[PDB]
Amino acid sequence: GSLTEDGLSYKEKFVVRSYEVGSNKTATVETIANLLQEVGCNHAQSVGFSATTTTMRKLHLIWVTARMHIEIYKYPAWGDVVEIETWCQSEGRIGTRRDWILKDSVTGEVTGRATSKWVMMNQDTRRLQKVSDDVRDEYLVFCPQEPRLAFPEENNRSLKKIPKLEDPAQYSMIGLKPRRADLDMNQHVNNVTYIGWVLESIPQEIVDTHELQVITLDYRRECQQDDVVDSLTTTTSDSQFLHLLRLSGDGQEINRGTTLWRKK
Amino acid sequence: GSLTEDGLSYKEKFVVRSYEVGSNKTATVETIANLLQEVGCNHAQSVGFSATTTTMRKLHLIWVTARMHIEIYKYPAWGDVVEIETWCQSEGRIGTRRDWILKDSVTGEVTGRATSKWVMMNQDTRRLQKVSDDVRDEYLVFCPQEPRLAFPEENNRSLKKIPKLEDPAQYSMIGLKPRRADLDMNQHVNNVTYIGWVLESIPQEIVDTHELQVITLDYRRECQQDDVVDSLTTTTSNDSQFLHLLRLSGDGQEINRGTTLWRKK
Numbered sequence: 431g432s433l434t435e436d437g438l439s440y441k442e443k444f445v446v447r448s449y450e451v452g453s454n455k456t457a458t459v460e461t462i463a464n465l466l467q468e469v470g471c472n473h474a475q476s477v478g479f480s481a482t483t484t485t486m487r488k489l490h491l492i493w494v495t496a497r498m499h500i501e502i503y504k505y506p507a508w509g510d511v512v513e514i515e516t517w518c519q520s521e522g523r524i525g526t527r528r529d530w531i532l533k534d535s536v537t538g539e540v541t542g543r544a545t546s547k548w549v550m551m552n553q554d555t556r557r558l559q560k561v562s563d564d565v566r567d568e569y570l571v572f573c574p575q576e577p578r579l580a581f582p583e584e585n586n587r588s589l590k591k592i593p594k595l596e597d598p599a600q601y602s603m604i605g606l607k608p609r610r611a612d613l614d615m616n617q618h619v620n621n622v623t624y625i626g627w628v629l630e631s632i633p634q635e636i637v638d639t640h641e642l643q644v645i646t647l648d649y650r651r652e653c654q655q656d657d658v659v660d661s662l663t664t665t666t667s668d669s670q671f672l673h674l675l676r677l678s679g680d681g682q683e684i685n686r687g688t689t690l691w692r693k694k
Numbered sequence: 695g696s697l698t699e700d701g702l703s704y705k706e707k708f709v710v711r712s713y714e715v716g717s718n719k720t721a722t723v724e725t726i727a728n729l730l731q732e733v734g735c736n737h738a739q740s741v742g743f744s745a746t747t748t749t750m751r752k753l754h755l756i757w758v759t760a761r762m763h764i765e766i767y768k769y770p771a772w773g774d775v776v777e778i779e780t781w782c783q784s785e786g787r788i789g790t791r792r793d794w795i796l797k798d799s800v801t802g803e804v805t806g807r808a809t810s811k812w813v814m815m816n817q818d819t820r821r822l823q824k825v826s827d828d829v830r831d832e833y834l835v836f837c838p839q840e841p842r843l844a845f846p847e848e849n850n851r852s853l854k855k856i857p858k859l860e861d862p863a864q865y866s867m868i869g870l871k872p873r874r875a876d877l878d879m880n881q882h883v884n885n886v887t888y889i890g891w892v893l894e895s896i897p898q899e900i901v902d903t904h905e906l907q908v909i910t911l912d913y914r915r916e917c918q919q920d921d922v923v924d925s926l927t928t929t930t931s932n933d934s935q936f937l938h939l940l941r942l943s944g945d946g947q948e949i950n951r952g953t954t955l956w957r958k959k
C-alpha cells in the first residue's frame with residue numbers, strides 16, 4: 431500500500447484468501463473488519479506513528495475505539511482484489527475519526543464504506559481524556575483540512591444513538607470466551623472478536639437467507655482474557671436487530687449494536 | 695503465487711499482517727497453518743482441481759487431513775515477506791502427502807517446514823477407503839515422480855506414533871466451542887481451529903517464556919458446529935514437551951491427539 435500523492439490518505443490492495451470467506455464464497459464482515467484495521471496500521475506506520483504520538487507515549491495515552499460503523503454493498507469473492515482507502519480527521523476535544531472506502535479493484539466501483547470514532551484514555555487508569563488543550567497539533571498535518579466523510583449525509587445511520595436491549599432477549603448465545611488467536615500483540619481482545627460475538631446470537635436461518643448490509647457497534651468496556659460473554663439479539667423490524675454483549679456473571683455491558691440484513 | 699518452471703510445485707509470498715502476530719510481534723503458528731492451507735488451495739486451483747478430481751466428485755469422495763506436522767525455526771515479523779513452496783506426492787493406496795517449505799524472502803533461508811497426510815472419505819457416509827488406480831492416475835502427473843520430502847531425516851518426528859493422554863491431565867481448558875469465524879466455506883470447523891484449541895491448555899507462563907518449535911496433530915473425528923470440546927495437556931519432559939488430547943466435553947469422544955516441543959527464548 432502507499433500514501434496517495436497529497437500524503438493525506440492511504441491505499442492498499444488485498445487478494446481475498448480461501449479461509450477468509452463464508453458459505454456464499456465471499457469475504458465475512460470479520461475479514462473486512464480485519465483488513466480495515468490492517469490498512470489503518472499501514473497508514474500509521476507510513477507517517478511515523480504507532481496509533482501513539484510522542485506526547486501520548488509520554489503521558490501514557492492511547493487511542494481506543496468508541497464506535498465502528500460498516501456498510502457493505504457487495505462482499506468480494508475468494509481470489510478477488512479489494513482496494514481500501516483510509517484517512518483520519520480530528521473532531522476537536524471529542525477525539526479522532528478514521529474512515530474507509532472499499533472498491534472492486536477491476537471495476538473501480540465502491541463496494542463498501544466504514545467510519546469509526548476513537549477517544550484518548552490513559553492506558554494504566556483507563557480514564558477517558560479529552561484531546562489535549564492543542565498539543566495534538568502533532569497529527570492535524572496528516573489529516574485533510576476540509577471535511578472528507580465516508581458518510582457525508584447530515585443525520586445518517588453512522589451517528590444514530592443505540593438503545594439498551596431489555597430482558598428477555600429474543601435470542602442468545604452464552605458462555606463465549608476468547609482464545610489466544612483472539613488477542614492482539616499486546617494481549618487485549620481484538621476489536622473484531624466483538625463483531626463475531628455480536629453476530630453469534632443471530633439465528634442460522636437469517637444468516638442462510640439474508641446478507642449483512644449494515645453493522646454499528648459501541649465499545650463500552652473491554653473483555654479481558656479470562657472474562658466470559660453472553661450475546662443477546664432481539665428482532666426490531668429487510669431484517670433489523672438490536673444487540674447487547676455483557677459479562678456472563680454480573681451482566682456488566684461491554685457492547686451494544688444494531689445490524690440490518692437484506693434478503694439474498 | 696505461481697507454479698514453478700516444471701509445474702510440479704507452487705510458490706507464493708505473503709506479507710505478515712498486524713492482526714496475524716502474537717506478543718513476540720511475530721506470526722502465530724495459527725497464522726502459519728492458515729498460510730499453508732491458502733498456498734495449498736492456490737496450487738489446487740492452478741492445475742484445475744477444486745481438493746477433488748472428476749472421479750472423486752462423481753463417487754462423492756473428498757481428501758481429509760489425518761495428520762499435520764509443522765516445524766518452525768523462526769516466526770516471520772510483522773511486515774516481513776515469507777515465501778512458501780508446496781507440492782504433493784502419492785503414497786499409493788494409503789492417500790496423499792502435501793509438503794511445505796517456508797523461507798525468508800530477503801535472506802532466502804529456510805525458516806520452517808511442514809508435512810501433512812490426507813486420506814479419502816465418502817462425504818456422506820464419512821467412510822475412509824483406499825485410493826483407486828482410476829483416481830490415482832488423474833493427479834499423479836501433478837506430483838514429482840522421485841520422492842521429494844520436506845522431512846528427509848531417517849528417523850523424523852513427522853512420522854512418530856502419538857499415545858493417548860492418561861486422566862488426570864496436568865492442565866485443561868474446558869467448554870471450547872466454535873463460532874462462525876471458525877467455520878470454512880462448507881460450514882465445517884477449520885483444521886487450524888483444532889491447533890488453537892490444543893494450544894489453549896498450555897499454561898501462559900510457558901507461552902510467555904518459550905517458543906513453539908514443533909507440533910504434530912492427528913485428526914480422529916470432526917468437531918461439529920454445535921459440539922463442545924475439552925483440551926488436555928500433560929508435560930512429558932531446556933526443552934519442554936507436552937502430550938495433547940481434544941475430546942467432546944460430554945461423552946469424552948477423542949477428536950485429536952498431539953505433541954508440542956518448546957524451546958526457551
Ligand SMILES: CNS(=O)(=O)c1cccc(C)c1F
Pocket residue numbers: 473474475477479481482493518519526528548569572573
Ligand atoms: C488513528 N488516529 S491518529 O493516530 O490520530 C492519526 C491521524 C492522522 C493520520 C494517521 C495515520 C493517524 F494514525
Ligand SMILES: CNS(=O)(=O)c1cccc(C)c1F
Pocket residue numbers: 737738739741743745746757782783790792812833836837
Ligand atoms: C491434496 N492432494 S491432491 O488434491 O490429490 C493434489 C495432488 C497433486 C497436485 C495438487 C495440486 C493436488 F491438489
